[PDB]
Symmetry: C6
Subunit: 219 residues, 6 copies
């Protein structure tokens, strides 16, 4: 985070012990369940790339994921370098140097420069850009660490329909399917993978049935 | 949440780790008991649509319920578009745009626009409007996840009357009864579903008996 | 709660997660023991009717008690309406309870000159309805609190004045019971010692005597 | 507690949920061990009589002690009335205890020139009444604290001065007991060593000698 | 602690429930292990004598140590009176907080020049606590000997833990690396340590016996 | 930490009890796992040398590590003295470590123009000394991390890059081992698949291949 002191100068505020401990415990408890990504975006709110690396470094295990996270950050950093060229004009007084991909990731940039890009006019939100790469790389990890595929989620003979749909849309969240696929799967794979008792009831409802009606029907 | 900084500018303050952890743990412990809904309204006090989505996304399980919650949000968003039409023509620079249904849900609107609408005179409470849609969709989930119907709540032979009334008005809360239906059932289903020993005492009290007198009578 | 922001405007501040969790856990743990009422009044300090309903609604179980609490709130609301006819607008009984009044209106009445403490009025009704619940949920009657043969006198007096608190006896009755029902319901060994002390004996001297 | 708001007006701020929960848990865990009194004085720092009653009312059990505590508060209130006749109004004994005085009046007396600290006066009565409870609830007397044959001297002295704190001994007795009752109640092995040290021995030298 | 209010007036702020509970639990858990002294100095940072006595009084057990702590406070108070004959000038009993109000203590602390009665009194408490830690140390440094199968890392943890409670100088701790640490090692690690020769850091010694 | 008071004067603010307890527990729980170092750099944010010593002194066990940490601090202090002769006074090595410098001087150097970041310089020495400890306390060598017969490849890579982190390998060494030692130490089933992928394979493609 960044704060303006009484002098009007933009200074780096330290990340609190509650936030650091919160981020450590959720990774310890939830590993890489899909809800970890919204929790990371919440705890790292308004953070600099320096603060984002602090939170990533504090994670103890899961170094296979962290090494993959670095590779995704390197790929996004090289993509930034390509389509943002480094202009040959002399650096205007009071304006900062143009942010490079490695500067946004925080490897080759100081904390003062990061505050400079974030607070100057126009602002270059290197914190938000870098967090976009991290969440992007974390989504890939969640997709890989997902144990079951959506095609294998089939309802049991005695399993309640409510529990089956919980597993179905849990798997669909880890596989990071689009929202339209999630809405579409209601009338396609969800009915197909149901047991013969619920499937007969679901087909009788016909097309265009909301999930509310489908769970009421198999109750 | 929103805060007025030292300059007097309305800035978005981070949702605290205490609030986030509180909302996560209540969903883990209480699932979808009726008291979860007041807890959400309390924890999400003064939140932007961005903050409401943060709280909803951090929920780990119950993806069947969350998928139904999305459908109810889409239905309320489309209803907003119907009776508040928006002329989405190109708007002059610096001019607040009229809130669309998807803007209230937070999918197609920035965090700055949401603060703009909320801290306006007169205020356009996109945070409160969106919370109304969420609680509306949450009440439907509680009704569905309610296991027993009010008609099946019958007092046992040796069960104390106090415990039976605890179960009765708990079931009646999940089934989302009106206050008049809850007040009226005191002289209808509560007496009818009582055991023969207490029912004889309750009929002797006659009409117009408060719940206080009924519980004293069967003690 | 209510706060004055930097601008000088009276704004509603959100009830903290600590208070909400504190009030939920004490109802979960203590149910309706007499010490829950002072805990409620303490946690709901300076609250609007909106905040009071939030704390009451967050209670999970005990819906029999909450339904009785509504009836006591409705009875007090009609009594307010009878004593205050309706011609900022003057608060109606349902406005004090928070059913037919906005959060801005409640802040208006509380931060007015002269102030109309709708929060304190409504909390007075809530504590009133909660006291009836504590009396009802009291398991034993004060007449049934009798000291055991091997029970220490200290424990018997702990049970005695605990029951007397749930039955909502007056402070004067509580002071008076020291020489009447407390001595009468004691076991024979301590009762002989208590009568030897005579009239006008403090509880300090009584518990020292049966030690 | 009391706070000066933005306007400069002294307003009552609510006691925090941390403080209330802290005071509840210590009474549940420690009952009436001597350290509960300094814990009470710390948590109730700068409190009004209203806040002191809030903390006292939130205590769940120990109603025998709470009933004795009321009697000590009444006795100190009557002593105040005798030394201070009643003609801002002058605070009477029942006003200091907080039964017959509003929260605004209590703020008036505390934030006055010259200040009448009814909060500190009432806390002095409470701590006085609580010390009587700790003195009574002490299980063993100082004369019965004797060192075992195999008990280490360190543990015996821990028990000795723990009892002496609950028995609310004076500072002089605590210093003096080092050379009298601490040596007298020691076991024959340590007592022989303690007498060899002679007069005027600090507790440091006595515990080093029996190590 | 002390705070400057909105008016600019120095008022005493209440010690927080977190701090009090923190100080109570560390004494319950750690008893009088050497790290309790720095924990006390940190939690009682900027405290008045009134606040220091609040923290000392809240300790439940260990009244033998607390009684010894009182005697050391009395001895240091008499030493202050001998060097300083008698705003009023603070006497020894005023620094300990027995014969001085909370307003006087704030007066001395927020004075020009400041009379740090809080820092002076904390120096006496830490001094008396150091004596307690030295006494409550169970083993002597001479009895800390490495086992036959004990790892060298664990032996050095015990060695310098004992050496901390026995309150050895910083120089004594550094010098013992090649003297008593090697002498009290097992014959397998001792042979390795002597081969390293003089002037070996603790890093090289633990790598050698790994 | 350092704060600017209302007057504009730079004063030292107390290290919070949350921070102190956080740093103590992570050392109790994690000992000297590699993630302890970023946790230390985060908890000691903006701290003076006095505050850094407070955090180091509060550590209870691991005195073997703390004694080695002192030796590394002494070595870096002597290196500072060699590169900076001593003629506000200029900070010497022992002043940066905080042994021979007051808290006011440390604030003087830190809050000055130009700033002499004695807090950041001293923290650089501590993290340097902690990195040496983590390398020593690492149990297994990278050469011994071999995948089992039935072990999933994901778990083997977790162990591999955990060991590689404690040994404080460079980023290039971590990147290079993906196609070198990680493939060599895999089991015969996964190694056959990994060689078939050929050169230039990311870790993502390797873990998908052995799934």
């Amino acid at each position: 985070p960044i704060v303006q002191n009484l002098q009007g100068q933009m200074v780096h505020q330290c990340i609190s012990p509650r936030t650091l401990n919160a981020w450590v415990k959720v990774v310890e408890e939830k590993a890489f369940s899909p809800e970890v990504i919204p929790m990371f975006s919440a705890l790292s709110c308004g953070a600099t790339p320096y603060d984002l690396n602090t939170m990533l470094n504090t994670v103890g295990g899961h170094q296979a994921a962290m090494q993959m996270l670095k590779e995704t950050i390197n790929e996004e950093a090289a993509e930034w370098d390509r389509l943002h060229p480094v202009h040959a004009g002399p650096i205007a007084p009071g304006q900062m140097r143009e942010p490079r991909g490695s500067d946004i990731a925080g490897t080759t940039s100081t904390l003062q420069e990061q505050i400079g890009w974030m607070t100057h006019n126009p602002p270059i939100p290197v914190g938000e850009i870098y967090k976009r790469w991290i969440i992007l790389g974390l989504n890939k990890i969640v997709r890989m660490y997902s144990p079951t595929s959506i095609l294998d989620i089939r309802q049991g003979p005695k399993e309640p329909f409510r529990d089956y749909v919980d597993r179905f849309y849990k798997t669909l969240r880890a596989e990071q399917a689009s929202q339209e696929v999630k809405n579409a799967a209601t009338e396609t794979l969800l009915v197909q993978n149901a047991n013969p008792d619920c499937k007969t009831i679901l087909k009788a409802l016909g097309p265009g049935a909301t999930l509310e009606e489908m769970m009421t029907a198999c109750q």
